[PDB]
Design a protein around this nucleic acid. Structure first.
Ligand SMILES: [Mg+2]
Ligand SMILES: [Mg+2]
Ligand SMILES: [Mg+2]
Ligand SMILES: [Mg+2]
Ligand SMILES: [Mg+2]
Ligand SMILES: [Mg+2]
Ligand SMILES: [Mg+2]
Ligand SMILES: [Mg+2]
Ligand SMILES: [Mg+2]
Ligand SMILES: [Mg+2]
Ligand SMILES: [Mg+2]
Ligand SMILES: [Mg+2]
Ligand SMILES: [Mg+2]
Ligand SMILES: [Mg+2]
Ligand SMILES: [Mg+2]
Ligand SMILES: [Mg+2]
Ligand SMILES: [Mg+2]
Ligand SMILES: [Mg+2]
Ligand SMILES: [Mg+2]
Ligand SMILES: [Mg+2]
Ligand SMILES: [Mg+2]
Ligand SMILES: [Mg+2]
Ligand SMILES: [Mg+2]
Ligand SMILES: [Mg+2]
Ligand SMILES: [Mg+2]
Ligand SMILES: [Mg+2]
Ligand SMILES: [Mg+2]
Ligand SMILES: [Mg+2]
Ligand SMILES: [Mg+2]
Ligand SMILES: [Mg+2]
Ligand SMILES: [Mg+2]
Ligand SMILES: [Mg+2]
Ligand SMILES: [Mg+2]
Ligand SMILES: [Mg+2]
Ligand SMILES: [Mg+2]
Ligand SMILES: [Mg+2]
Ligand SMILES: [Mg+2]
Ligand SMILES: [Mg+2]
Ligand SMILES: [Mg+2]
Ligand SMILES: [Mg+2]
Ligand SMILES: [Mg+2]
Ligand SMILES: [Mg+2]
Ligand SMILES: [Mg+2]
Ligand SMILES: [Mg+2]
Ligand SMILES: [Mg+2]
Lengths: 125, 188, 155, 260
RNA sequence: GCCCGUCGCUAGUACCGAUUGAAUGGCUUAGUGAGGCCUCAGGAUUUGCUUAGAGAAGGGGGCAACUCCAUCUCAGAGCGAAGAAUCUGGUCAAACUUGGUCAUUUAGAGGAACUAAAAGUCGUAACAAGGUUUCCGUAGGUGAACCUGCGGAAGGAUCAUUA
RNA sequence: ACCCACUCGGCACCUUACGAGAAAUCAAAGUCUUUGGGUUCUGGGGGGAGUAUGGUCGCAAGGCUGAAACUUAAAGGAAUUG
RNA sequence: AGGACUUUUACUUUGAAAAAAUUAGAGUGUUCAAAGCAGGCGAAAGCUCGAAUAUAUUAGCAUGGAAUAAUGGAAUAGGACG
RNA sequence: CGGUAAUUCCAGCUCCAGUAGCGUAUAUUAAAGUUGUUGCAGUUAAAAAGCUCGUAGUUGAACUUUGGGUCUGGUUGUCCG
RNA sequence: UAUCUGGUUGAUCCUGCCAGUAGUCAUAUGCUUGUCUCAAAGAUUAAGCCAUGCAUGUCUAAGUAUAAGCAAUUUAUACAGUGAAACUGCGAAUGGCUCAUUAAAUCAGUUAUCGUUUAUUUGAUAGUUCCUUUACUACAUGGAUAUCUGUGGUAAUUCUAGAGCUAAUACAUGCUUAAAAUCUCGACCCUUUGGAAGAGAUGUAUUUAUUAGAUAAAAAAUCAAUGUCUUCGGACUCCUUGAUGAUUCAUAAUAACUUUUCGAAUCGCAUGGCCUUGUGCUGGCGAUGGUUCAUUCAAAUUUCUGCCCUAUCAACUUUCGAUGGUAGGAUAGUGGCCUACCAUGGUUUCAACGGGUAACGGGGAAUAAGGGUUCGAUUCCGGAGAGGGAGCCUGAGAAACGGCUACCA
């Protein structure tokens, strides 16, 4: 018997599987950024939800509290290092305002498309 | 195989505990020594962690101590006259701890004679001066003189022949003897 | 519930290895050995000058007090040389955030130096296993009566 | 289990040996020795992991066998020797000397320490008793039984074994206002001064400790090891001197002292 | 319009159930009780101390108490020491026989049912004042729903007689 | 004995919603998503079923306690128009 | 640092404790990630920061508080002090 | 849904959802404010014992120093150095 | 990660469930299946039964070498190299697997052992083994015994009987070896303050009695006992005592006791120094042992609190231990753990006792507004078990089962 290393899920399928507006939005996001499946949007939404649970938990805590300072500025520095959160809004209250499209935008796919060396999103893929 | 664990006993409430963890080796209990008198025969038993134990069945002679002047002598056990737990051992002459036995009592007698010389039951100048400095302080009580005249001393064993293998004890003396002789007169 | 005779049973009752010399002419009562259990617990003078024996006395016997110290109320003083103490407490059920009155019955061994009766609150201390169920020795009778200190009414 | 246990699974090893939870089913169980295995440190862990002088078990065995390791002036050729707190590990090759003292994160840190002071060791007094024929003796935390000690050396005290003859060189008396180390619990590695020692009649003495940064905590007396007088430690304290900087302060240290 | 019950047919479910059933397991009265352990004995054999008299041929390194020698060797006899089989009493007690008891499965003639299936039959109780208002408790009766008696209740078909 | 005014307690009653309810309606069935005064009993779809079994009470009648197997997509409450 | 008396709780703050793995969570380009406790930097001539923290809501131990909730004093004075 | 025009059965075409995964069965969790301590209902929908007394359990009126003045220590927002 | 929708009706508002929905380190199964990393995996019913093969043996320069095994060459008159086999020593009680039994049982957190055993590891630890010492092996005491050489038996098994040698850190014995001091017993004298030639025992280990193991603080008189010095008034001034919260603790002392434990008759390397120049005197680094006390790995018990459903289980337990007392036995040790004699007690509506668990406990998993519900056979910690039962040898540690004995299947 050897110590296990923990596998863990990275997405969460939505509750209502046949929401028309939600399905159309998911197809819009898949076609805009050349996503292979709709599991990609689920994964980005799950990452956003984890970040957001952390953000709201830190918000609940009192201002000028060591936990608030340490973990809040850690999360903000990580997100601005990723690039999704602009340097203007390093406040931990705009961190709740991030949308799934923001993390979609920082994908290497969309970055290669932006730089211009790939003239199409599917070409970037 | 004789266990001494608490599982087989009922709970304090009274429920019958179900069987669990068939009894171990660190819970064992061995047979009683139920020692006797005569023809010294001590059997070694190898207990937990070495530590040789000695069963002392059939033991005839042992050390006995006198508390008043505090002197110990090897002497013979001659029968058991009272046992505080079960008179059955007395009838069977089984010798265990706290039993009351009779003593040949001679070694104490001539130790007294060479020590004070009061001629119970009825020289160099150094010994004479020792006795003079003593100045008859040996005013030991009357009942011990009574069984000295009888010749057999009343002693209570204090060693555990079942475990140690020895047969050591001390003579009844003072109110001790008093108590037990009343009990003996109850037997008489 | 205590016999007038200082030894009543068939075996003699002595404190082991404390010896009074009969050949000596001091003629004091006896040589009674005692100790203090510590923790700032006062040995009772009834044990100090008493004549009982009680092998399992925290103050005069071989047993030593160490470990838990429990305060309870006497629920049964009417079995020989031992006491049954009711310890009440509140178990906290968290699913309701509510407490639950509960009680346990702790057997113990009260020395003859103490005069106990039903209803006395008692401080008791841990010791060696004395019997199958008793593991505590009564160390203090805090409330001797509680509400029976004054009984009569004669103005 | 019927009898002693001779295997230590990797997850069951103390989190201060702080091995890799993968790459092995078991962990080095320290053999019986001068220290509790929960508190000690096997030589294989100290060499293969802490020092990386070796690579695996065979290399550690070859190192120990040729008598290059010297624990407290003795060879100790067994792989899982429990080299515990304050022991001295000498390697004549690289002429290096280590003394095991917890870094404030609470771990057996590699402390390279000078040869001159490596001649001696410090120890906590755990018992003062009278052995046969009326000879007084003192038992330290290593289990060293030092015969004929100073008559006013008491329990919980500290002493300075010369580690060559193994006798009594000097000692420090436990009392308030004295530099002290912590050897267990949340306050591992912390160094301070004894402000008060509340007695607590009946057991489990506690002492309050205030360090140089003027922070205060409280620890059990079993968990305490007097190390010297304030401003004058009797040993060479490790880097950081066990101040226990806050996590935010540690982040500020990472940011400030930074060059790449 | 809607629906009530008896009897009639089919499939399933469950129950009772004489058979004084059957199996398993649990305990357990009573009677046996392997084997180990302890103990009482016992004493094949192995041995050591002994002078216990021989042949040995300096079976001492001086025909002889060898100027004996861990000398050849058994009748010795004693004293030990170890000591197998066997064996006295316990003790732990597996397990066997015998009944008793309980629990679960297990059949089982026959009996009383309940469902679903609704195009059988006899009536038409209820829903309207259901054409005898309804319903409840209790008792009797009868192919069947139901009827009747005595107390209630409106969920009544009256919130109302100072007309 | 009435008449007028007031007060305590009781069976009650009229109006009203400014409150509550699915409403019929309730001055309590209010002070309940702005949810906590104390406290006891009961119900978790309908049927099987207040049946069987096991207790317990009873002379008896029967009372108290009291399921499941199985079946079913409804049964039921108030009110609106015919 | 010693004798001395200690009303006792319930409650609540803080701390020591509640093994590692797991959950949370800091750092870290495993090519990203699940993960892992790694790694990073020299001129390439040995120099290095790490392996963070928190929570467990019960039982026990210590500690500060005295509202809320409970018990006990002095009524025969056998009460408190000198 | 299927009774001679089947958007529901068997097929062809088109399309939809997830996608190297998807479909079923049982179990279980959220949905379940359908277990309700937070947080359920009892007039008629299921549900207030026929009523009263009563041990245990649960709960239980108010009251016992509240004020002030000064000095002084940290933490803030102050105005600016 | 605070959400609802279809269905009772001609139609409505409800109560209500059915159904839908999304999970699931929850499996099974169906249809498909290209890659990299990663990985569960005969738990559910049957802790049902097992062929076959492995799963524990071990040698360093340092316990024993005469393999009639190998090397016989640069190291070789006892032996040295390598090394089968066997004796010796040690482990085999770790690990691995399963969850059958078990509902204050295990287990978790928290205590205790001033209530006990503990191979090993680590640190210390002993002159006395003399017993009348003016006659002994201490320059080394004895006998077996495997391996082996040969004879067999049985159909076979890790079956071994007879004969012949042979060894030890195996089994037995046993020697030095000081001094000192303390206890005891006296060939005498000289009138007290009596004080002295001299003789035996005392290491440790065991057992039992007794003593010391103190301690709040300044002075007295007196009587007796009677000790030192007396500069003959009398002064007595000096008394040593460790630890905890507590002890009869640690320890010391006296008397004794033992079918008398230990106190090195053991190995490797280097073999130096002194010259008393001989095999003489000494002499280093280790390896194994070895008594006791510690320390460590532990092991046993042990305090408080915490467990799922059930009253269609309300009283349960005690002649056969049920609660307590005492003494004894046994235990490593406390303990009705067992026995003898006494007392009649202990638990319970705060759910005892009984029944059920398709129940091993826990760390944890799924699920997620908050509160919770369900699961936890399994990677870690504990417990239990080896077909069901009992019994036991060896050891420090087993009621072991890849150890034995017996019954049942
Ligand atoms: Mg194991
Ligand atoms: Mg049918
Ligand atoms: Mg027999
Ligand atoms: Mg008709
Ligand atoms: Mg009709
Ligand atoms: Mg009509
Ligand atoms: Mg009609
Ligand atoms: Mg009609
Ligand atoms: Mg129903
Ligand atoms: Mg009904
Ligand atoms: Mg009936
Ligand atoms: Mg209607
Ligand atoms: Mg943890
Ligand atoms: Mg994570
Ligand atoms: Mg068509
Ligand atoms: Mg409801
Ligand atoms: Mg109705
Ligand atoms: Mg109704
Ligand atoms: Mg009612
Ligand atoms: Mg009441
Ligand atoms: Mg009040
Ligand atoms: Mg919810
Ligand atoms: Mg309807
Ligand atoms: Mg319709
Ligand atoms: Mg559903
Ligand atoms: Mg490839
Ligand atoms: Mg299985
Ligand atoms: Mg072997
Ligand atoms: Mg060799
Ligand atoms: Mg049970
Ligand atoms: Mg004493
Ligand atoms: Mg002692
Ligand atoms: Mg006893
Ligand atoms: Mg089970
Ligand atoms: Mg488990
Ligand atoms: Mg479980
Ligand atoms: Mg199972
Ligand atoms: Mg396990
Ligand atoms: Mg086992
Ligand atoms: Mg099997
Ligand atoms: Mg062994
Ligand atoms: Mg077995
Ligand atoms: Mg096997
Ligand atoms: Mg095994
Ligand atoms: Mg075998």
């Amino acid at each position: 018997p050897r110590a296990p290393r923990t596998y863990s899920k990275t997405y969460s399928t939505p509750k209502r599987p046949y929401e028309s507006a939600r399905l159309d939005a998911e197809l819009k996001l898949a076609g805009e950024y050349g996503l292979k499946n709709k599991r990609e949007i689920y994964r980005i939404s799950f990452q956003l939800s984890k970040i957001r649970r952390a953000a709201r938990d830190l918000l609940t805590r009192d201002e000028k509290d060591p936990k608030r300072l340490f973990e809040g500025n850690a999360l903000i520095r990580r997100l601005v290092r990723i690039g999704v959160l602009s340097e203007d809004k390093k406040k931990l209250d705009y961190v709740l305002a991030l949308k799934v499209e923001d993390f979609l935008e920082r994908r290497l796919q969309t970055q290669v498309y932006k730089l211009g060396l790939a003239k199409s999103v599917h070409h970037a893929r | 195989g004789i266990s001494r664990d608490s599982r087989h006993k009922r709970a304090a409430t009274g429920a019958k505990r179900a069987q669990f963890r068939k009894k171990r080796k660190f819970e064992l209990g061995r047979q009683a020594a139920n020692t006797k008198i005569g023809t010294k025969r001590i059997h070694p038993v190898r207990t937990r962690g070495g530590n040789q134990k000695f069963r002392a069945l059939r033991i005839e002679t042992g050390n006995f101590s006198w508390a008043s002047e505090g002197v110990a002598r090897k002497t013979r056990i001659t029968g058991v006259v009272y046992h505080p737990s079960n008179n059955e051992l007395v009838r069977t002459n089984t010798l265990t701890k706290a039993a009351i036995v009779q003593i040949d009592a001679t070694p104490f007698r001539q130790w007294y004679e060479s020590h004070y010389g009061q001629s119970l039951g009825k020289t160099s100048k150094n010994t004479e001066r020792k006795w003079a400095a003593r100045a008859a302080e040996a005013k030991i009580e009357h009942a011990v003189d009574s069984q000295f005249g009888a010749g057999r001393l009343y002693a209570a064993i204090s060693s555990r022949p079942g475990q140690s293998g020895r047969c050591d004890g001390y003579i009844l003396e003072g109110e001790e003897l008093a108590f037990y002789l009343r009990r003996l007169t109850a037997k008489k | 519930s205590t016999e007038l005779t200082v030894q009543s049973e068939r075996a003699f009752q002595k404190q082991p290895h404390i010896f009074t010399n009969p050949k000596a002419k001091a003629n004091r009562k006896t040589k009674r050995w005692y100790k203090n259990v510590g923790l700032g617990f006062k040995t009772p003078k009834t044990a100090i000058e008493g004549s009982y024996i009680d092998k399992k006395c925290p103050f005069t016997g071989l047993v030593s007090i160490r470990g838990k110290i429990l305060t309870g109320t006497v629920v049964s003083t009417r079995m020989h040389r031992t006491i049954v103490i009711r310890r009440d407490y509140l178990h906290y059920v968290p699913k309701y955030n509510r407490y639950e009155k509960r009680h346990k019955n702790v057997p113990a061994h009260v020395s003859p130096a103490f005069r106990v009766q039903v209803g006395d609150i008692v401080t008791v201390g841990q010791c060696r296993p004395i019997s199958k169920t008793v593991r505590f020795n009564v160390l203090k009778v805090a409330s001797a009566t509680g509400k029976a200190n004054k009984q009569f009414a004669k103005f | 289990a019927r009898g002693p246990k001779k295997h230590l699974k990797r997850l069951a090893a103390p989190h201060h040996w702080m091995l890799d939870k993968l790459s092995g089913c078991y962990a080095p169980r320290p053999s019986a020795g001068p220290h509790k295995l929960r508190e000690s440190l096997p030589l294989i862990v100290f060499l293969r992991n802490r020092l990386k002088y070796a690579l695996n078990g065979r290399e550690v065995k070859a190192i120990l066998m040729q008598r290059h390791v010297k624990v407290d002036g003795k060879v100790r050729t067994d792989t899982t020797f429990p080299a515990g707190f304050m022991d001295v590990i000498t390697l004549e090759a690289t002429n290096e000397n280590f003394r095991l003292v917890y870094d404030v994160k609470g771990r057996f840190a590699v402390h390279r320490i000078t040869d001159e002071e490596a001649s001696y060791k410090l120890a906590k007094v755990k018992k003062v008793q009278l052995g046969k024929k009326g000879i007084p003796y003192v038992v330290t935390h290593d289990g060293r039984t030092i015969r004929y000690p100073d008559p006013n050396i008491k329990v919980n005290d500290t002493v300075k074994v010369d580690l060559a003859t193994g006798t009594i060189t000097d000692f420090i008396k436990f009392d308030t206002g004295k530099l002290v180390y912590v050897t267990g619990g949340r306050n591992l590695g912390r160094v301070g001064t004894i402000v008060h020692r509340e007695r607590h009649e009946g057991g489990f003495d506690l002492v309050h400790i205030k360090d140089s940064l003027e922070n205060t905590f409280v620890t059990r007396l079993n968990n305490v090891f007097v190390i010297g007088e304030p401003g004058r430690p009797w040993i060479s304290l490790p880097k950081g001197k066990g101040i226990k900087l806050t996590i935010s302060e540690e982040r500020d240290r990472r940011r400030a002292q930074h060059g790449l």
